[PDB]
Design goal:
The structure is cut from a larger assembly and holds 8 protein chains of 8 kinds.
Chain B lengths: L6 H11 L11 H7 L5 H17 L7 H11 L12
Helix pairs in contact in B: 1-2, 1-3, 3-4
Chain D lengths: L2 H11 L3 E6 H4 L7 H14 L3 E6 L14 H17 L8 E6 L29 H11 L9 H5 L7 H17 L7 H12 L11
Parallel strand pairs in D: 1-2, 2-3
Chain E lengths: L1 H8 L3 H4 L17
The chains are: A alpha+beta (239), B mainly alpha (87), C alpha+beta (248), D mainly alpha (209), E mainly alpha (33), F alpha/beta (395), G alpha/beta (401), H alpha/beta (304).
Bound molecules: adenosine-5'-triphosphate (2 copies), adenosine-5'-diphosphate and magnesium ion (4 copies).
Chain lengths: 239, 87, 248, 209, 33, 395, 401, 304
């Protein structure tokens, strides 16, 4: 009886509506992000769109600024709003402070907006979790995850959405300094992270690759094919 | 009609059921009656009995008003604690 | 239950009011659109075909928004009118600010943002209207856009909204040839689909509206087919069906 | 309009056993007693056949079956299901006929209006300028009446009144004639009774209209 | 429950009306003859 | 004492396939059965004292012997017994009756004419309870369950290991779990696990449904529950399987109906037998339900139900194990790759996996084949599953 | 387009295939089943035990002598005496008769209202009988002290104190109350969440009551026949009154103490009303302290919960951290644990958990340490048990820090 | 009397004086459960079902094949199917198919339909189910037909005042008798319903309802077959084209097809003739297939 209002505390001090908003994130396609020394990658599974529909409008990885990008989970309707407000915020921050927006700052503002939307009745929580990464630290790669609650955290590597637990365990098992020593190895690591929960062929794995002082580079199907071929070569070498 | 005892009725009932017990002259039965809204006669008798037992627990030879208030609390199974936001 | 208001999240994390609004869309009349190489069209079914009802607007289901956009409508009539009025307002506002026609997707995104805001803030019910969009723009050309009551849109080549949507969409996916459809073939396919999408037989012209979008000399003329050409398409489909059963 | 009266006429004119129940009789407490009574009625009709079952005011237990979410709500659906099974189920009745009377006929379950269960759906409309004349003549035939009263004056009036309203008009006319210590019914008391019975609006609070 | 009362008052009670026995109900389209 | 009345079962035959070794094992079992029949048939026939005493006791008892209830014991040779009609009689106790077990409330045996106590009805079990006892153990063993390794381990550590190896629990100082509930989606393996437990157990097994525990009369429900648990106590190592506990385990609430309150009373008697005044004894209770959230908290609280064993829908490995088990008897083809059916979306249960095999065999019979193929399996899958979901909202 | 199976198809399907050993195996299986049935039918006795004494114990041919000489006597209570005096006897449900005593007994022995034995032919009174004692009610006594004590209850110091103050101290030391003129409560309602230890406290009370402890079986109070439950309650209270300072325990009082409504329970409500007027009303109850426990006190009749029938209402709330630590120590005293187990940490890891859940945690820790072949349960096993018992039945915890 | 035939719960006869067991007698059956067994088979035959041939063949793979030739299932290594559910729009032939099965079967057919299992007292429904399955096992092989299974087989509602818990207890007893601790041998169940989504997931699960046979509304050829079946005894005129009548009945049910024949005959009865013309069939098509629409364009125009 304590889960029908956002501003009502349960006897054990639980805001159950916020947790129910969290539950919507787990119903979205997985997004995997891992940062390297000179690379930040955003793995995303595709839902194998209908044969008679265009994928161009089902974009899940979007860039807030010229050098910060985010991948979300949960409902697309809330995610689009969050991304639009984040873009407006980074542009406004550039206007007031000529320095480019920081990935930490944009993460903090996204978390603040989510928190403001889970602070009163008559405002449904944003049921999306965002994986914000970027080289905005001017020489330092950063990765961030915003829970729909309004809390953000810095992760060396993290996963959100359906099957996030398995990918998180995988990454905890093999995210090492040696694994991310080069960009190609980091991209391969993203590929192995996404393969286990997304079993399928090509076009089901979308990777966003951003290099230092560069722009977002959504890998074409040919590139993910060559990387998955490389992974198959590695596993056949292992056997 | 047998109604729920009012303030005067509750005070009189507590006086009746405390007649056999050694009670301080300082007990304000009018204050007790105010503190026991929606109490029937049986609950007032239980208030007196529990006040007597609370006095006996402390080894007090005579009852006190605070003993009666604690008995009022114990009749409805309520427990009073020092709340951290009530100062 | 967890459907008292739209802001309530189910323990599984589902907006029950939003899902209710979408499931309610099937009550609306059948609307569909086919994207062809030379243009895009919309097809609608008139549920109300009473002889005492006069047809004065001829556009009860298909609305013109901009000089290069049009939209079909399926859902609550009042919400439909509100959304189309807002669509015209956004279109003219963008035209005033930028002095160029809207790139289709921007206007659809504006409506979807408004609808999402309605399903997010308390005290407002979600807009129980799902509407298809057609238009041409300088960036990607002809596009067919779908809108849901939740504000989730998506690019599509051919869809159907309203009564018996699933069957129409399935047969669309079955017999649509990507990149090999002309406007005439698209019209024939739309008529074929609308024939058995609705239970009414013979596909009366008075019960069906079709509007087509074309790119002629950089003008983007929006044409609503009159009863004559609709009846010609009906007779063409009838003769095609007669030819098909000749093999039997 | 004369539904129950026609069922009464059928009961009087038939050589088969007649069973008369009300749809409200089936709605009981003690779950499983409603369908038990439905089954009891149908089995009773089966034992002494041919038989006729008249379930008047069945509109109570006839509403379109929806997803009932309470036990009491499921009880009426269970009653309707038992009635459907008894009418057209595994045990074909044979030689028993079921007559039902409602006032809506559109809120009823489509399974009940199935051509295997309720073959004929006969409409009993409000009497028109013809049926009203026949009703007036039939009712007033036994009444003493008078030479000066002309029932055609009252029949031609545009007021839409059922046969029960006609009977009430005639009974009030008799009461008015008897109140004035008169054994004859004339135009004046008949007219006053007509005006009294016609007044059916009561309050209506003046703004619904 | 109301319909049951409607049927009870419209039963054969007025059919026989044995030996002029009336009903004197006391309390607080039911008002027609 | 009255030790456990374990269900009887024959030794299992391993080969399964209709080979010669299976025939030899079955012939050996038949040979032992024939030897037993011959021995216990030639016993009484070859056989050619106590007869005088038995005859004297039988003539003194007479026939028929009425069954009454002992009310009071007045002297060593006099007592008040109430006949089944409710009338008490001051009768005499005959010498050939144990005065030790003659206790008030017991069912005494009375002479038809004099009504003197001539014996005591020892069992006197309610016939509605003695049916619950399992006599023929089910043939489903633990080898008939695919996956469910954790569930099998918990159920064993609760009901089987304490009997087989009590030393671990004795040395550890812990009393083994005496109550388990098996909950999960329908067709997952709850009743299968209970059947396997009954097949493997050496203790007496009592199976109820939770709907036969409800009786028409007022006090007969709780009385039946008490009689069932008394019978479980009589045979010291006992397992009571209450399937479909939702039937009576539903949450208590203020109900304005005699039936609902009586059912709540039955459940209260059940959970007073489970954990109340007096120790329950060496009686372990297994409960099964498809809806544990609707159960009364007092019923499934620790102390009554110690292990809440979850039974989730099978995953890929469990689905493969169930397919291997349920296609073992089938004459499978070569092109049949079960992995295509094992994949599924998320909702293939163990019960569905067996219906898939049955339907595939039926489709093979349709084509006059006794060897099922891949097309048969896919047709069976798309024929046998009945579904019921969110729309395209989440990305 | 599927085709039905024909007789030739059936014959081929049952023949064309494996048939060298299938027929033999099937026949052997069937005849093994038949032999099993035949063995069962041949033995099929399971001789039912009857109360037959050892042959040396009876060895009596005089049993026939007493069978023939002694006559059975119907029991009946002499309701009214008549003054040759006549006697009106009530033969339970059979009938009422006006009889006279046989020559064996004297008129002085027979008094009004006592139950006597009468012959089945003339109904003459032949022998007076002791007053009826109910067998079910007399078995409602405990007479066997449970082996749990107050030291086995942890985290209920004040609850145990109040319970003793009602049911123990007035019986043991009535002087501490009569001097101050204090009338002790005669009833307790132990209410709280299930598993908090109210039944355990009742058992501890019965373990040291040193008086008559009566545990009331709720099933017996609910009888099939009308008016029998109220009668049973009446005899139960009478039996309690015969004894000195009786103790009566009603566990799960909500079984019969449900709120009245308007046939429903009726008979159960009548039994509850009988218990209500026995506890308080005319005819003072006497030295009978009643004990009642229930985990759903809200469903009880307000008349039964009235503080003249259930005077003291003790709440068994969830234990605090000190209480949870005490319960952990109590339930791990016999456990083979290590010396470094921080039971305070385990108590803090079970925020809202009853003592039953603590015992379940200890049992699961022992089970975990048994699973791996270890004879000592480490703190890791207790942590795993706490997880499995409390936590089993991360993104949500991500918000808290 | 051999003691070995005196099994528990049998009704023995005892002499007037010594109560001597002298006859074994038929077993006791609850009188309400005794009338559930079909004694006079229904007259509906398989040839009276038109348009449902696949449905008949699928139902005979569970009702007929497992009991007539059980050796095939042991040889295949599969388990015999036990239950079939017939679901579809009203008047499609579910009860007609159940009546035809009860006519052509050699097994004991037991009918228990509607609320025969819904009793006032507590536990009576469960006891009736238990004794029904005991009776079915005694007369094995047997077929239980549960028509209108929505009455007791609806989805389990949570407890409370708004709860059908007693009917749910009866349903749970039925569930255990269908797939529980004790397996049922040579007992098949047929269930019919118009709402398959109302039924509980535990009742529809495989093992209890192995095959779900759907009865869609007859197509044009199926409608023609039903028309020819229900007009076989009718004196059709020479200019009767029953195919056109089938085309004039789109989306009709089997009961409506029969009602059309009945009304076409009733028109001839009205005109006092024993033959029917095409016009009679066409007017009956209109009289039977008369639907009710919204009648208020206001409500119709809420949705564009
Ligand atoms: N894990 C499994 N491995 C093998 N067979 C299984 C498994 N789970 C289920 N089955 C099969 O499914 C059949 C039906 O399942 P079962 O009797 O165990 O149901 P349940 O879990 O008790 O559910 P419900 O009581 O709702 O029917 C079993 O007889 C068995 O053959
Ligand atoms: N305070 C406690 N101290 C020690 N052990 C406890 C405590 N409370 C409960 N327990 C343990 O929990 C077990 C079950 O508790 P108990 O039988 O007393 O439950 P209850 O409170 O009477 O609940 P219910 O409502 O189910 O009757 C006891 O046998 C005991 O081992
Ligand atoms: N496929 C069919 N072929 C022939 N007659 C049919 C068919 N379907 C229905 N009917 C006729 O219509 C009636 C349908 O009633 P019934 O089958 O009992 O309804 P339900 O299927 O809803 O139980 C039957 O009397 C039957 O004679
Ligand atoms: Mg009427
Ligand atoms: Mg089961
Ligand atoms: Mg207890
Ligand atoms: Mg039917």
């Amino acid at each position: 009886s304590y889960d029908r209002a956002i501003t009502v505390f349960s006897p054990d001090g639980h805001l159950f509506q916020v947790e129910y908003a969290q539950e919507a994130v787990k119903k979205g396609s997985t997004a995997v992000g891992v940062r390297g020394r000179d690379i930040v990658v955003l793995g995303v599974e595709k839902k194998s769109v209908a044969k008679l529909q265009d994928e161009r409008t089902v974009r899940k990885i979007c860039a807030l600024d010229d050098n910060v990008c985010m991948a979300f989970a949960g409902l697309t309707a809330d995610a689009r709003i969050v991304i639009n407000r984040a873009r407006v915020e980074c542009q406004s921050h550039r206007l007031t402070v000529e320095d480019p927006v920081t990935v930490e700052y944009i993460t903090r503002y996204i978390a603040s907006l989510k928190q403001r939307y889970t602070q009163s009745n008559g405002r449904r929580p944003f049921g999306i979790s965002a994986l914000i990464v970027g080289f905005d630290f001017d020489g330092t790669p950063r990765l961030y995850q915003t829970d729909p609650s309004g809390t953000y955290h810095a992760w060396k590597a993290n996963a959100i959405g359906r099957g996030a637990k398995s990918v998180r365990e995988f990454l905890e098992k093999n995210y090492t300094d040696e694994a991310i020593e080069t960009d190609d190895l980091t991209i391969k690591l993203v590929i192995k992270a996404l393969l286990e929960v997304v079993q399928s062929g090509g076009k089901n794995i979308e990777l966003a690759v951003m290099r230092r002082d560069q722009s977002l580079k959504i890998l074409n199907p040919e590139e993910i094919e060559k990387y998955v071929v490389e992974i198959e070569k590695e596993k056949e070498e292992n056997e | 009609e047998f109604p729920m005892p009012n303030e005067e009725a509750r005070a009189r009932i507590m006086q009746i059921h405390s007649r056999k017990m050694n009670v301080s002259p300082d007990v304000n039965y009018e204050e007790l009656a105010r503190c026991t809204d929606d109490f029937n006669g049986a609950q007032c008798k239980a208030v007196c009995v529990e006040a007597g037992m609370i006095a006996l627990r402390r080894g007090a030879t005579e009852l006190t008003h605070e003993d009666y208030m604690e008995g009022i609390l114990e009749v409805q199974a309520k427990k009073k604690a020092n709340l951290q936001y009530y100062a | 239950r967890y459907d008292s208001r739209t802001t309530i999240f189910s323990p599984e994390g589902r907006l029950y009011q939003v899902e209710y609004a979408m499931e309610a869309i099937g009550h609306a009349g059948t609307c569909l659109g086919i994207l062809a190489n030379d243009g895009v069209l919309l097809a609608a079914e008139r549920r109300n075909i009473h002889k005492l009802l006069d047809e004065v607007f001829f556009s009860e289901k298909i609305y013109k928004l901009n000089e290069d956009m049009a939209c079909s409508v399926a859902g609550i009539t009042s919400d439909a009118n509100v959304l189309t009025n807002e669509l015209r307002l956004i279109a003219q506002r963008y035209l005033l600010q930028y002095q160029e026609p809207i790139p289709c997707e921007q206007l659809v995104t504006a409506l979807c943002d408004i609808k999402q805001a309605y399903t997010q803030f308390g005290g407002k019910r979600p807009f129980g209207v799902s509407l298809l969009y057609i238009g041409w723009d300088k960036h990607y050309g002809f596009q067919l856009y779908q809108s849901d009551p939740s504000g989730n849109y998506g690019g599509w080549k051919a869809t159907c909204i309203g009564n018996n949507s699933a069957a129409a969409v399935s047969m669309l996916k079955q017999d649509y040839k990507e990149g090999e459809m002309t406007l005439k073939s698209a019209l024939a396919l739309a008529i074929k689909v609308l024939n058995k999408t609705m239970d009414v037989s013979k596909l009366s012209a008075e019960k069906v509206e079709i509007a087509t979008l074309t790119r002629e000399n950089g003008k983007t003329v929006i044409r609503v087919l009159k009863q004559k050409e609709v009846e010609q398409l009906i007779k063409k489909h009838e003769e095609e069906e007669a030819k098909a059963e000749r093999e039997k | 309009c004369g539904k129950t009266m026609l069922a009464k006429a059928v009961a009087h004119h038939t050589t088969a056993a007649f069973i008369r129940v009300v749809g409200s009789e089936f709605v009981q407490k003690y779950l499983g007693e409603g369908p038990r009574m439905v089954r009891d009625v149908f089995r009773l009709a089966k034992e002494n056949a041919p038989a006729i079952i008249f379930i008047d005011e069945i509109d109570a237990i006839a509403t379109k079956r929806f997803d009932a979410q309470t036990g009491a709500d499921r009880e009426v659906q269970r009653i309707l299901l038992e009635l459907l099974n008894q009418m057209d189920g595994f045990d074909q009745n044979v030689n028993v006929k079921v007559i039902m009377a409602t006032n809506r006929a559109d809120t009823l379950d489509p399974a009940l209006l199935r051509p295997g269960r309720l073959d004929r759906k006969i409409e009993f409309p409000l009497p028109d300028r013809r049926q009203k004349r026949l009703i007036f003549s039939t009712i007033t035939s036994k009444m003493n009446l008078s030479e000066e009263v002309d029932l055609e004056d009252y029949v031609a009036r545009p007021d839409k009144i059922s046969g029960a309203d006609i009977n009430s008009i005639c009974q009030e006319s008799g009461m008015l004639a008897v109140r004035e210590n008169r054994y004859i019914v004339l135009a004046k008391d008949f007219e006053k009774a007509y005006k009294t019975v016609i007044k059916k609006d009561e309050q209506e609070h003046e703004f619904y209209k | 429950i109301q319909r049951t009362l409607m049927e009870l008052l419209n039963q054969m009670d007025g059919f026989d009306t044995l030996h002029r026995v009336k009903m004197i109900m006391a309390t607080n389209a039911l008002l027609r003859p | 004492t009255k030790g456990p009345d374990a269900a009887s079962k024959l030794p299992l035959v391993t080969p399964h396939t209709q080979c010669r070794l299976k025939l030899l094992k079955l012939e050996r079992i038949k040979d032992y059965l024939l030897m037993e029949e011959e021995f216990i048939r030639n016993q009484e026939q070859m056989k050619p004292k106590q007869e005088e005493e038995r005859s004297k006791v039988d003539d003194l008892r007479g026939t028929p012997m009425s069954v009454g209830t002992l009310e009071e014991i007045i002297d060593d040779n006099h007592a008040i017994v109430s006949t089944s009609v409710g009338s008490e009689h001051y009768v005499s106790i005959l010498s050939f009756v144990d005065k030790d077990l003659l206790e008030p409330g017991c069912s005494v045996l009375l002479n038809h004419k004099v009504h003197a106590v001539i014996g005591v009805l020892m069992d006197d079990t309610d016939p509605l309870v003695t049916v619950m006892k399992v006599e023929k153990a089910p043939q489903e063993t633990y080898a008939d369950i695919g996956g469910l390794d954790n569930q099998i381990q918990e159920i064993k550590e609760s009901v089987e290991l304490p009997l087989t190896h009590p030393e671990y629990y004795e040395e550890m100082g812990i009393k083994p779990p005496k109550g388990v509930i098996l909950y999960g989606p329908p067709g997952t393996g709850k009743t299968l696990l209970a059947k396997a437990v009954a097949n493997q157990t050496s203790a007496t097994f009592l199976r109820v449904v939770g709907s036969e525990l409800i009786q028409k009369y007022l006090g007969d429900g709780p009385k039946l529950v008490r009689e069932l648990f008394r019978v479980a106590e009589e045979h010291a190592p006992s397992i009571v399987f209450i399937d479909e506990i939702d039937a009576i385990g539903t949450k208590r609430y203020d109900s304005n109906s005699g039936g609902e309150r009586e059912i709540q009373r039955t459940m209260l008697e059940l959970l007073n037998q489970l954990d109340g005044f007096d120790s329950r004894g060496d009686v372990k209770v297994i409960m099964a339900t498809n809806r544990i959230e609707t159960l009364d908290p007092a019923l499934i609280r620790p102390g009554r139900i110690d292990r809440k064993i979850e039974f989730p829908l099978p995953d890929e490995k469990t689905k493969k194990r169930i397919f291997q088990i349920h296609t073992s008897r089938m004459t499978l083809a070569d092109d049949v790759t079960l992995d295509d059916l094992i994949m599924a979306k998320d909702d293939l249960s163990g019960a569905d996996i067996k219906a898939i095999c049955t339907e595939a065999g039926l489709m093979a019979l349709r084509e006059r084949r006794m060897k099922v193929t891949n097309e048969d399996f896919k047709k069976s899958k798309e024929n046998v599953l009945y579904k019921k979901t969110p729309e395209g909202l989440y990305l | 387009p599927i085709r039905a199976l024909d007789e030739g198809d059936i014959a081929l399907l049952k023949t064309y295939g494996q048939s060298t050993y299938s027929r033999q195996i099937k026949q052997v299986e069937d005849d093994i089943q038949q032999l099993l049935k035949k063995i069962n039918e041949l033995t099929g006795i399971k001789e039912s035990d009857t109360g037959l004494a050892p042959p040396a114990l009876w060895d009596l041919a005089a049993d026939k002598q007493t069978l023939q000489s002694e006559q059975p006597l119907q029991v009946a209570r002499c309701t009214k005496i008549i003054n040759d005096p006549k006697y009106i006897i009530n033969v339970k449900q059979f009938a009422k008769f006006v009889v006279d005593l046989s020559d064996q007994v004297a008129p002085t022995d027979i008094e009004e209202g006592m139950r006597v034995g009468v012959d089945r032919n003339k109904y003459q009174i032949h022998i007076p009988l002791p007053p009826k004692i109910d067998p079910t009610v007399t078995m409602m006594q405990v007479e066997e002290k449970p082996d749990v004590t107050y030291s086995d209850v942890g985290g209920c110091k004040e609850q145990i104190e109040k319970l003793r103050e009602v049911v123990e101290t007035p019986l043991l030391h009535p002087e501490r109350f009569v001097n101050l003129g204090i009338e002790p409560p005669k009833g307790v309602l132990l209410f709280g969440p299930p598993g908090t230890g109210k039944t355990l406290c009742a058992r501890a009370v019965a373990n040291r009551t040193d008086a008559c402890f009566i545990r009331v079986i709720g099933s017996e109070l609910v009888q099939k026949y009308v008016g029998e439950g109220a009668r049973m309650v009446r005899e139960l209270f009478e039996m309690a009154r015969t004894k000195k300072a009786c103790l009566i325990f009603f566990d799960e009082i909500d079984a019969i103490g449900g709120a009245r409504f308007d046939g429903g329970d009726n008979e159960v409500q009548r039994t509850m009303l009988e218990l209500i007027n026995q506890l308080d009303g005319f005819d003072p109850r006497g030295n009978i302290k009643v004990l009642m426990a229930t985990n759903r006190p809200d469903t009880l009749d307000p008349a039964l919960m009235r503080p003249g029938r259930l005077d003291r209402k003790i709440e068994f709330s969830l234990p605090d951290l000190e209480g949870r630590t005490h319960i952990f120590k109590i339930h791990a005293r016999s456990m083979s644990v290590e010396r470094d187990i921080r039971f305070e940490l385990l108590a803090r890891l079970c925020p809202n958990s009853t003592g039953a859940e603590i015992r379940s945690v200890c049992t699961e820790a022992g089970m975990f340490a048994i699973r791996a072949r270890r004879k000592i349960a480490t703190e890791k096993d207790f942590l795993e048990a706490v997880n499995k018992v409390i936590k089993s039945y991360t993104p949500r915890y991500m918000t808290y820090n | 009397i051999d003691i070995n035939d005196v099994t528990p719960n049998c009704r023995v006869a005892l002499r007037n004086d010594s109560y001597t067991l002298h006859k074994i007698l038929p077993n006791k059956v609850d009188p309400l459960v005794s009338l559930m067994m079909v004694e006079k088979v229904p007259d509906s035959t398989y040839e009276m079902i038109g348009g449902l041939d696949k449905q008949i063949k699928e139902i005979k793979e569970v009702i007929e094949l497992p009991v007539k030739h059980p050796e095939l299932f042991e040889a295949l290594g599969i388990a015999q199917p036990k239950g079939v559910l017939l679901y579809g729009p009203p008047g499609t032939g579910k009860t007609l198919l159940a009546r035809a099965v009860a006519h052509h079967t050699d097994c004991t057919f037991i009918r228990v339909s509607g609320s025969e299992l819904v009793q006032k007292f507590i536990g009576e429904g469960a006891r009736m189910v238990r004794e029904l399955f005991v009776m079915a096992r005694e007369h094995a092989p047997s077929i239980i037909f549960m028509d209108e299974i929505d009455s007791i087989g609806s989805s389990r509602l949570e407890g409370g005042s708004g709860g059908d818990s007693e009917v749910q207890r009866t349903m749970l007893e039925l569930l255990n008798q269908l797939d529980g601790f004790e397996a049922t041998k040579n007992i098949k169940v047929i269930m019919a319903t118009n709402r398959i989504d109302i039924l509980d997931s535990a009742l529809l699960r495989p093992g209890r309802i192995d095959r779900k046979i759907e009865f869609p509304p007859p197509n044009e050829e199926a409608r023609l077959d039903i028309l020819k079946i229900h007009s076989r005894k009718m004196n059709l005129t020479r200019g009767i084209n029953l195919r056109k009548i089938a085309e004039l009945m789109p989306g009709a049910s089997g009961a409506e097809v029969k009602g059309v024949c009945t009304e076409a005959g009733m028109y001839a009865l009205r005109e006092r003739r024993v033959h029917v013309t095409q016009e009679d069939f066409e007017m009956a098509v209109a009289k039977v297939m008369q639907k009710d629409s919204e009648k208020n364009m206001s409500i119709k125009k809420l949705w564009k």
